[PDB]
Design a protein around this nucleic acid. Structure first.
Ligand code: NA
Ligand code: NA
Length: 327
DNA sequence: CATTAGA
DNA sequence: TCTAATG
């Protein structure tokens, strides 16, 4: 957590590279595991050799630790940090819709910057376009005060369309968070479950609504189960227009909401922990269900959930307000 | 780890 | 159909 810091940070840097700038999946996967084990270990790696002891810790990585250990640096890092081609990749990549693959491609054509990409709007697709045209606000954070803003509206049309809908803005907002990146609404309707072969309309109904009135302003992607998009709070009585904000609406068989709800809300650790616990408590929690463990090694059989509560009772735990679902 | 674009 | 990008 701190005795291995320099390591694990130098290494990840290392890994993050091969996977992007370069296509070296393997080497990339390697530094990660390495960065992984070297971080576990309880002592101060005083030398690569002592490190080398560890699994994944080959001659390659060890050498690296030695030079980082000896001098406050590492050239390969100092070189990469410098690399303008690389450097670029790293950045275009910020464009929602640009990934590593498209990064290299653009760069190899010569687009390496914001403007570069403007002049080549044609060279972008709808997604990457909106991504372009929204470059700034996509980076911008979202105040809770704003979360709480949009939340309101959303649940309004939701209810206005069909009173039988259920929506819940999940995430860290869900967990109290003084600010957030995007809105995660989980949605479900009783008239849709495990079997009841769809009703794409259910999802398609609401997107229309929100859109109608003004919330949704863009289409990033829409499928019969998950809609991807943009939104903007109405710009008041002027002098202040709200900026553009990512949004994700997703359908759900009412017979799997609670776990779905439990889960997305996290925290990544809270889940992991409560999840580890059900194992003892003779269970198995995972994204849409909770099944009873059968000694043979494994079992199945989805227990019935009506609330975040059933899940808790089942594993015989304390209902944890989302607020403190922190870990 | 799954759902969408798009080519 | 695959392959990229998101989450
Ligand atoms: Na070893
Ligand atoms: Na991106």
């Amino acid at each position: 957590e701190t005795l291995n810091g320099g390591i694990t940070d130098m290494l990840t840097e290392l890994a993050n590279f091969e996977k992007n700038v370069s296509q070296a999946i393997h080497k990339y996967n390697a530094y990660r595991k390495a960065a992984s084990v070297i971080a576990k270990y309880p002592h101060k790696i005083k030398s690569g050799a002592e490190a080398k002891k560890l699994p994944g810790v080959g001659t390659k990585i060890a050498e690296k630790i030695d030079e980082f250990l000896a001098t406050g640096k590492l050239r390969k890092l100092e070189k990469i940090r410098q690399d303008d081609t690389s450097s670029s990749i790293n950045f275009l990549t910020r464009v929602s819709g640009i990934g590593p693959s498209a990064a290299r491609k653009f760069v190899d054509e010569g687009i390496k910057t914001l403007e570069d990409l403007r002049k080549n709007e044609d060279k972008l697709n709808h997604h990457q376009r909106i991504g372009l045209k929204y470059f700034g606000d996509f980076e911008k954070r979202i105040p809770r005060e704003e979360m709480l803003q949009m939340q309101d509206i959303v649940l309004n049309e939701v209810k206005k369309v069909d009173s039988e809908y259920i929506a819940t803005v999940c995430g860290s907002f869900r967990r109290g968070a003084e600010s957030s990146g995007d809105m995660d609404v989980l949605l479900t309707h009783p008239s849709f479950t495990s079997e009841s072969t769809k009703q794409p309309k259910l999802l398609h109904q609401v997107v229309e609504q929100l859109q109608k009135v003004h919330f949704i302003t863009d289409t990033l992607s829409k499928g019969e189960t998950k809609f991807m998009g943009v939104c903007q709070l109405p710009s008041k009585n002027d002098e202040k227009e709200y900026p553009h904000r990512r949004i994700d609406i997703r359908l759900i068989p009412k017979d799997q909401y609670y776990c779905g709800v439990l889960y997305f809300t996290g925290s990544d650790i809270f889940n992991k922990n409560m999840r580890a616990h059900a194992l003892e408590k003779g269970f198995t929690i995972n994204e849409y269900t909770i099944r009873p463990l059968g000694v043979t090694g494994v079992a199945g059989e989805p227990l019935p959930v009506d609330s975040e509560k059933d899940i808790f009772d089942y594993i015989q735990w304390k209902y944890r307000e989302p607020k403190d679902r922190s870990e």
